[PDB]
Amino acid sequence: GRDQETTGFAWWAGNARLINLSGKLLGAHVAHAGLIVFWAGAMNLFEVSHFVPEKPMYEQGLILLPHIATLGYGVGPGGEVLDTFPYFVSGVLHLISSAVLGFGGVYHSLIGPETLEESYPFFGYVWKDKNKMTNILGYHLIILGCGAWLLVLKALYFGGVYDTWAPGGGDVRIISNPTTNAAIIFGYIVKSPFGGDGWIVSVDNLEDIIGGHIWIGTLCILGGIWHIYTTPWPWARRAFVWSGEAYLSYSLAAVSLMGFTACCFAWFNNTAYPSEFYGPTGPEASQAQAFTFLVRDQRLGANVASAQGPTGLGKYLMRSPTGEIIFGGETMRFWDFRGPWVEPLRGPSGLDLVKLKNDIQPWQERRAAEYMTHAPLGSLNSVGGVATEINAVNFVSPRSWLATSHFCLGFFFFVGHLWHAGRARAAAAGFEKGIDRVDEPVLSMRPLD
Amino acid sequence: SQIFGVAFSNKRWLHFFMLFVPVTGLWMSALGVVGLALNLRAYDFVSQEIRAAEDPEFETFYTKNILLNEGIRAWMAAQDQPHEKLTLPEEVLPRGNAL
Amino acid sequence: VNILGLTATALFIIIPTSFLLILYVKTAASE
């Protein structure tokens, strides 16, 4: 590669040396893509190597098999596993594709051409070339739209996707008539992120999922064609910084928001993250506790509408701050929960009293019992329960692992966005090295600060 | 000066402040632990405690802390202090509703 | 302790404030 005297960047910033080296930059990117595909294949095969047919996938520390099963591979009615060969095929295809991408990354990193400008003008670029920057953005936008449409095709004609909201415990269903209504699609986007609305995390049906994917795929392809055939406007040119590190900073802020959103999706959403495969959410486990303690005490011959707590509020049933009937206890804070095991018992007034007394189902009762016994509560040792509990159960929820890891990654990537936004602005300005010591700006400003 | 309103302008006083802050903090903590060596606690506020005894409706975070401290003492004494031979039965230990 | 505390707090404000304000007015009076 190079040394510090020919680049000015030390080894702890050695990748910065290849900011202007387009070929080595491309090789580092595709070698990284090989790493991502390699981890996906390696972890997927490791997970199917550590898979037990009896226990569900949330008890065994699985985070990729629930994704594949949500897509509708190897699962049937209720979420039991029919075969693991789709998971094995996914893992193997990922490993071999990672081998190919790693060959390419090693090739451009070691013996690939230094710069792609003098010989392959389609691929070589300078960072201040706004036309070709938008061209590459359009290529990648077309690729993203094609991926979104691949999910749409999978949901429409390639076996369907897993629905937890279908009757009988949920199953793999073929999506028919997705919600292409623009108001329904963008009301999620314009929605508030807070309780009761949850921004886009509160998408709660596969019709909305696949309709939103139709919209994102079509808009992404349209934006790709638009970016390939246009050049940025002067107001955008004035508004932006047009260096490679600036483009990196923009990407970092974007994927940081994406990581925080994925944290909230894993922690709250149960239709894109079906509770059979990922375990119960926090609200789900609390409502499950209150639900099964309702039905146990009903079967022990007690009244549920009566028997207020020590506070005079209602041990089993109270009213939410808007009026409809919700489960008693501190689980009132999770009154916003909506699951497939509460909806057949929930009507216009919230929890229906006669339906809750009479129309219990065995699968709902077992699901509530298990969503009590496997709550997203655990330690770093993977010891289940609260921090005061025994070392007897080996369980930490995949929801807990995903939410924690992706909040950490989202936070550092926001901080990396700060670092790169500041350094890109300072490098465009001439400040990346320090103050000039003879043209210091503060010395040209009046005193009194 | 433009971000915070006040700023250092003497390097020597800046570094003496960087020296002064942790030393004064640790010395004050040392003096407080010396007070605690003789059980001279700042455990209670007499006015707020008598108000909370003469009013059930008075509830504050400080009173919650006092209750939590009673819980800590009574749930930790038996296993931490074997010399007292404190065989407190499960009967008399402080405990809230459920849990 | 509701009046004794008040006079203790008032003393502990005023006396060191008086001392420091002696020293500051003295210092600033020398330009």
Partner: peptide
């Protein structure tokens, strides 16, 4: 009677903060 004292002490600290921000000794370049 005590809330009077606490309020006075708090606004006194805030007043000293205000005076320290906007009424400091101006530093000189020399």
């Amino acid at each position: 009677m005590e809330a009077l004292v606490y309020t006075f002490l708090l606004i006194g600290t805030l007043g000293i903060i205000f005076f320290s921000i906007f009424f400091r000794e101006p530093p000189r370049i020399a």
